[PDB]
Amino acid sequence: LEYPIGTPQNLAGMEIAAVYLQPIDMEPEGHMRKASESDIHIEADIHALSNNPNGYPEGFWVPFLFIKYEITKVGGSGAPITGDMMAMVASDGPHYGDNVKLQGPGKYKVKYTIYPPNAKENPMSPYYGRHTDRETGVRPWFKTFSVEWDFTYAGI
Amino acid sequence: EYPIGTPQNLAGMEIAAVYLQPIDMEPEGHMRKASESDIHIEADIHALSNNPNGYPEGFWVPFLFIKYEITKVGGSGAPITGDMMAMVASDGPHYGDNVKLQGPGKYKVKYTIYPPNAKENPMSPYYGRHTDRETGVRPWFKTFSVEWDFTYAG
Ligand SMILES: [Cu+]
Numbered sequence: 001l002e003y004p005i006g007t008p009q010n011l012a013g014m015e016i017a018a019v020y021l022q023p024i025d026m027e028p029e030g031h032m033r034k035a036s037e038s039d040i041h042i043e044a045d046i047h048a049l050s051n052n053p054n055g056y057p058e059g060f061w062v063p064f065l066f067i068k069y070e071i072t073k074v075g076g077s078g079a080p081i082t083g084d085m086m087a088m089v090a091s092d093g094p095h096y097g098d099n100v101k102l103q104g105p106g107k108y109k110v111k112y113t114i115y116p117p118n119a120k121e122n123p124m125s126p127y128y129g130r131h132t133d134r135e136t137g138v139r140p141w142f143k144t145f146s147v148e149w150d151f152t153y154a155g156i
Numbered sequence: 157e158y159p160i161g162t163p164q165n166l167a168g169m170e171i172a173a174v175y176l177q178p179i180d181m182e183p184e185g186h187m188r189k190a191s192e193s194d195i196h197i198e199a200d201i202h203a204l205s206n207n208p209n210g211y212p213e214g215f216w217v218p219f220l221f222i223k224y225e226i227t228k229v230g231g232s233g234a235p236i237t238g239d240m241m242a243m244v245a246s247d248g249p250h251y252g253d254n255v256k257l258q259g260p261g262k263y264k265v266k267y268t269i270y271p272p273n274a275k276e277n278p279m280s281p282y283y284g285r286h287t288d289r290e291t292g293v294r295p296w297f298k299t300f301s302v303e304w305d306f307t308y309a310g
């Protein structure tokens with residue numbers, strides 16, 4: 001099932017929502033930590049709002065982003081749980097996600113750092129372009145930013 | 157914004173071939189210089205109803221790889237070949253390339269459309285598909301080609 005995380009946030013003509021599901025299985029295998037080695041599938045749900053700066057019609061999935069996440073158990077002085085999401089498709093459409101192993105039931109904080117197509121850290125920079133001519137060009141890509149939420153994990 | 161024939165409904169997607177004047181793009185070094193090209197050729201690919209790879213109708217189909225072959229009818233030159241690149245423009249994301257043609261006249265335009273997991277698709281390690289019963293989708297479509305007749309006005 002789905003376990004939404006807080007309320008969606010917006011920036012730069014995109015809506016950013018966080019949710020987790022039960023761990024999933026994915027092709028290509030050997031990318032997702034196996035479902036049996038995980039507690040949840042964390043996801044970032046990112047869609048264009050109106051007047052999107054890069055030409056996306058409202059509602060379109062925003063592709064070719066790179067998302068790094070940090071999940072910290074509240075009150076914990078231990079190391080945060082970190083990883084990189086991967087772009088993928090599921091029955092509900094494309095999203096960014098990762099299978100994650102948590103640190104038991106309780107309160108967590110979740111931070112997503114969202115990299116644009118042209119960020120150094122985004123491995124997809126050489127594969128996705130942007131028109132820059134006057135007639136068909138669009139605005140520059142957004143700059144890297146982070147968004148945070150709190151959530152409770154009960155065990156699924 | 158100019159059409160190459162009419163769109164074809166294939167593999168749960170509308171595949172349209174269009175073109176416009178040569179463009180400029182970030183990142184540099186992928187498109188041929190606009191001044192050294194004749195057109196920007198594009199593949200406009202969106203999901204139809206009941207798309208089997210998880211896309212709601214009208215969505216752009218991302219992470220594909222498109223190779224094109226443009227042949228002048230009766231031409232003695234080599235066919236014009238290349239790879240499109242995914243990119244965004246004012247009307248949305250598409251696949252495109254700046255192309256130099258071989259003068260005005262009749263051409264055949266063929267696109268070979270590769271799914272995310274094709275050997276030929278360099279984006280295969282970057283795009284996944286859920287396979288579990290609850291949230292999975294059907295296997296990626298099989299690589300296919302689509303052709304049209306094109307008259308270049310010059
Ligand atoms: Cu996923």
Ligand SMILES: [Cu+]
Nearest residue numbers: 243251252253
């Ligand atoms: Cu383009």
